[PDB]
Each structure stands twice: as C-alpha cells, then as structure tokens.
Write a protein that binds this ligand. Structure first.
Ligand SMILES: [Ca+2]
Lengths: 318, 50, 98, 98, 38
C-alpha cells in the first residue's frame, strides 16, 4: 500500500529557493535545503529539501528518483546521481515527498550536489549535524558486536503518522523570459495552458491578466518597466520562507511527514572486562577502555557518594 | 461520525464528490476550507481515490 | 521547538500591515525599502516604497510524540511488597500492601 | 535557553506556552527570506548537561523504574507484622516428636 | 522475523531493506523476496 502513501505529494510540485553557497556564489537552487534534523542515534538524519522524491516528472511513481524544478520546467534524475556529505560522504537511503533520509557522519555543514551534463548544482548550508551514541560508551562509528539497548532512530518507511507540515498556494513567480521587445513596443508571450499577468508603469498605472496570447502593449518602450508574473492555481508548494505568498487566507491543506523518530533496537559495544583486585574493605579497579567509557560508582548507604567519570585512558581506580 | 464541507452540503468524509485525477484545483479548494477537521485524514485518503 | 515561518508578504509600491494570529511567541514586523529578486528576475519595478512582512512563530517539533520529557510532582508514596509467607507448611505468594 | 522553554500541558494539548527569545531581523537586500535570531533549544541544552539519573545516584541502593514510577529494594526501615492466628492450627504436644 | 529498525522489510537472508522497496519492480533481496507476493 505504498500508492496510498505517495498520493498526497502528487498534489505538490518542487520549487526553487535561495541557497547561500552554490557551486560559485549565491544562487537560486533547485536542491535548496530547508532543515536538517539529527536526533536519531546511530547516524540517520532527515533532510527537508526543495526537491521531491519517489515521484516522476509527471506525477506518477518512479522508484528511486529526485524530482526538481528547473526554471519552471520540472525535470528528473535517478537517485544515485545525487550525493551528499557532511565531513565524510553520507549514504542516501530513501526519499518520500520533500524529505530525504541519509546515514551521515558528524559535521558542521551539509552539502548536496548532483551533476547534469556540464552544469554542476550544489547547495551548502551551515546546519550542524551531530552523531548520538547509545549507552555509556562513546563511540563514533557503530560497532560490529556487543549487546542491544533500546534506541530511537528515524524509521525507514513512509508510514502516515500523526505529524504534519502545512501546504499553501504558490504565489506569483515572476519571469522575464516571457517579456520581450517588438520592433517598437513590448511583447508578452505567456506559455500554453498557463495564464500570466502583466504590470507596467509606462502610461499611468497599467495592469492586465492575459491568457494564451502574444499580447503587445503600446506606450511601453523599454521592457525594464514591465514585470510578467506566472500563475498556477493547482500544484501546492510548502510554506517556505524562500517563496513569496499569494493574496487571501493562503491555506490549502496539510501533508504528513515521512520517516519519523520511532523506538527501535541498537547494538552498542561492550567494554573490556575490568580487572578487580580485592583487599580489606577496599576494591581496586584496573581499566583499559577501548573507546571512552563512563565509570559510575555509588555506595549502598544513606550517603551514596556517587562518582561519575568519563575514562578514556588506561587507569587504576581505588 | 464526522461530516465534511464543500458548500452547505454536509457529505460523509469517507465519500467525497471529487478526486484529484479528475479535477486539478477543486480538490485542493475542498481541502482548503476543511483543514480544521479531526476527520481530515479520512477526507484526505478518500479525496484522492475514486 | 520548531520555528515556523510564513512566506514574506510582498506588495509593490504599497504598504502592508501586521495582522496577528496569537500563535505562540508570534513575532511580526513590517520592513520597508525592499527590492527582492526571484529566479526569473526582479520582483517589483518600484525602487523604494516596497514592503515585505516577516512573520514567525514557535510550534513544537514533529518528533514530539516519541521524544519528550514529562515533568511531574510526587508526594506521599505507597509501599507494596511481594511476600512469600509460609505458616505451618501452608505457603502463599501474595502481593501484600504494607 | 533552559528546560521548559516550550511548555505543552499534555502531548496533544494543542495549546503550548513558548518563551524562546525570538527576534525577527531585517532581510538581506535582494533576497526573499525570513531571518530570525533566538536562543537555542533548552531541551537540547538540558540533554547536554544532565547530571546522572536517579538509577545511578539513589541512596540505599534503590532501583528506579519507569512505567509506574517506582523504586525497588531500598534497604531501609523495617516492616512490622501482625499475625491473627486461629486456635485450630495449634497442634498438641504429643502429636509431634519430643 | 523483525528488523531492529522499524521501517525495514526483512529479506530471505535477513538483510533489512527499507519498507518502501517491497513490491516496487526492482530486485533488491537475494532471490527477489521483495518481489514474491505483490
Ligand atoms: Ca524490491
């Protein structure tokens, strides 16, 4: 029953947003990044991007794809062309809607990039990504063998749960490949099956909504004075701050978010066994930690005198 | 039970009159006014499929 | 938390206003002297007297259900033991309250 | 910036108190975004500090558990007992060895 | 059996692939156990 899950991001389209670090400078990117969440334990993060996943360029379902917005025309590539990295390369697991799930190492940035023919697209964001160990032994890469604590990692399926984001009317995405000059006037050519609207300032205050017609206007000489917007009544976007909004109550629905933080099981390491030397009312502890290990002691009386210590070197505690 | 709205026609939320593969923007407008609804997920998964 | 942000309301050669919603910690401010850009060129034709409204609010995170901390108050406890009593080779195992 | 900057009354209360020091900032000249500046998650800062649990610090060697909040096996105090024994259980002398 | 991570489907060999990869028209588990009963 995956088609019942995917059917709500069919109402939506990918968009372009402002990314601060692109391949050269500051650009408008089709793969812009809204938020990175890293609160699952063993290295799984969940990116909310400005692209869409698990859908094809039409609206139907293709398996491992990124769907993006390239200056209005929606394009697509396979998922194995898209790579992202924090410090080391991350590994993309799955995608659903505006959301992506990756297995990432710890780092102070996220950079997603894909490669078209001779254009390289990138988007680096200053979003901190952390790695959260489980248990009282602080590893950096999850181990090979040990025991199994309970944990909380981002679930890998796109099951509808009780958490939502809010969708809206896309506003007037302005264009300038529409407006062009005649030999003596200004010419607006809206695309087929799409209505534009034109605001100019060459007479007094001029404004028009045009449909499907190469519609010239007299008294406008230079095309710097006319802005040709674009309109799409269908096809929701996210409530982004990198997009402008429409006029009047703005709201069209809400969608569920995939890959929520669920309870699970995680494998944790097991420290080398301490070597215990006994004496008269005293206990010595030889400790050889492989990776840093909390020692926590307490006494079973009315004053516990608890001791809490991160130990990362070979140490003897009496 | 929960009754959803497109007009003054309180239809059952499991039985919508329209679907997205028929209408591009009327389904989105029907979902627009019915956001404050405890049966919005029922209206949602019914309003996709015919 | 999760700082939610509404899209910027932009009017060309106009002036917006602040309409509140009483969302939690809902800040709103109106900025004048703005010449915004889209991907397809500039957005207004006016140099000055344009207006952009920022609106932000705090809502709780999507993972609030499985990752939250419960603040309680406790007083006047109640002790309860699982005894195993044998009186004259007749044994029971009963939760006694003490 | 500390524990409880979000205060939701229950998990599904739909009315949360929030004091997160949110301040809106002026957008960069030529860009459509909503820039803010707020204090970080006090819940995360509580999780970074977190003086250890009562499972490891409790006096008398208690064993704190979760689903009912309870302690176990705290070796403190003493239980008195009352036995109301019927007279039928008292066997006579000569029906036992001596 | 069941995987340790909740969103995962368990293949024939015990390999846990994501649950949206079951019955997708693409073979991921040994002997196509993601493509047996669809
Ligand atoms: Ca498969």
């Amino acid at each position: 029953s995956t088609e019942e899950l995917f059917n709500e991001y069919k109402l939506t389209r990918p968009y372009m947003a402002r990314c601060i670090r692109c391949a050269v400078g500051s650009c408008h990117s089709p793969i812009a990044i809204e938020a990175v969440k890293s609160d699952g334990h063993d290295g799984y993060v969940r990116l909310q991007t400005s692209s869409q996943y698990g859908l094809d360029s039409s609206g139907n379902l293709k398996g491992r794809t990124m769907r993006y917005d390239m200056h209005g025309t929606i394009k697509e590539i396979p998922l194995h062309q898209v790579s992202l990295y924090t410090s080391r390369p991350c590994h993309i697991v799955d995608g659903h809607g505006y959301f992506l799930l990756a297995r990432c190492p710890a780092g102070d940035s996220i950079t997603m990039e894909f490669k078209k023919d001779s254009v390289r697209h990138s988007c680096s964001v200053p979003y901190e990504v952390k790695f959260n160990p489980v248990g009282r032994e602080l590893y950096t890469h999850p181990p090979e063998h040990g025991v199994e604590q309970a944990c909380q990692v981002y679930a890998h399926d796109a099951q509808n749960r009780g958490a939502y984001v809010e969708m809206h009317l896309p506003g007037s995405e302005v264009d300038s490949s529409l407006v062009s000059l005649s030999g003596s006037s200004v010419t607006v050519t809206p695309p087929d099956g799409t209505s534009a609207l034109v605001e100019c300032e060459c007479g007094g205050t001029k404004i028009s909504e045009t449909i499907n017609k190469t519609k010239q206007f007299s008294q406008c000489t230079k095309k710097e004075q006319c802005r040709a917007y674009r309109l799409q009544n269908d096809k929701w976007v996210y409530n982004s701050d990198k997009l402008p909004k429409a006029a009047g109550a703005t709201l069209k629905g809400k969608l569920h978010v995939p890959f929520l933080l669920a309870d699970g099981k995680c494998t944790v390491p097991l420290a080398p066994e301490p070597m215990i030397t006994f004496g008269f009312r005293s206990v010595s502890l030889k400790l050889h930690p492989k990776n840093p290990t909390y020692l926590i002691t307490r006494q079973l009386a009315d004053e516990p005198h608890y001791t809490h210590e991160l130990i990362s070197e070979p140490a003897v505690r009496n | 039970t929960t009754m959803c709205l497109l007009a003054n026609v309180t239809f059952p939320c499991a039985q919508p009159p329209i679907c997205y593969d028929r209408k591009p923007a009327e389904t989105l407008a029907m979902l627009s006014v019915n956001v404050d609804n405890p049966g919005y997920d029922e209206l949602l998964e019914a309003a996709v499929k015919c | 938390y999760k700082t939610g942000m509404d899209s910027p309301a932009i009017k060309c050669c106009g002036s917006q206003e602040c309409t509140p919603t009483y969302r939690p910690d809902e800040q709103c401010k109106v900025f004048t002297g703005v010449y915004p850009f889209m991907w397809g060129g500039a957005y207004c034709f006016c140099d000055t007297e344009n207006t952009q409204v920022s609106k932000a609010y705090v809502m709780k995170s999507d993972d609030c259900l499985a990752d939250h901390a419960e603040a309680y108050k406790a007083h006047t406890a109640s002790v309860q033991a699982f005894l195993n009593i044998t009186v004259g080779e007749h044994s029971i195992v009963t939760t006694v309250y003490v | 910036g500390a524990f409880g900057d979000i205060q939701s009354r229950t998990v599904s209360s739909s009315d949360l108190y929030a004091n997160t020091n949110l301040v809106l900032q002026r957008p960069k000249a030529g860009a459509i975004h909503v820039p803010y500046t707020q204090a970080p998650s006090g819940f995360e800062q509580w999780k970074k500090d977190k003086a250890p649990s009562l499972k490891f610090t409790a006096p008398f060697g208690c064993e704190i558990y979760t689903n009912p909040i309870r302690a176990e096996n705290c070796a403190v105090g003493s239980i008195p007992l009352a036995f109301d024994i019927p007279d039928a259980l008292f066997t006579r002398v000569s029906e036992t060895p001596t | 059996n069941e995987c340790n991570i909740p969103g995962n489907f368990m293949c024939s060999n015990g390999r846990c692939i994501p649950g949206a990869w079951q019955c997708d028209g693409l073979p991921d588990c040994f002997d196509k156990s993601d493509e047996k009963e669809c």
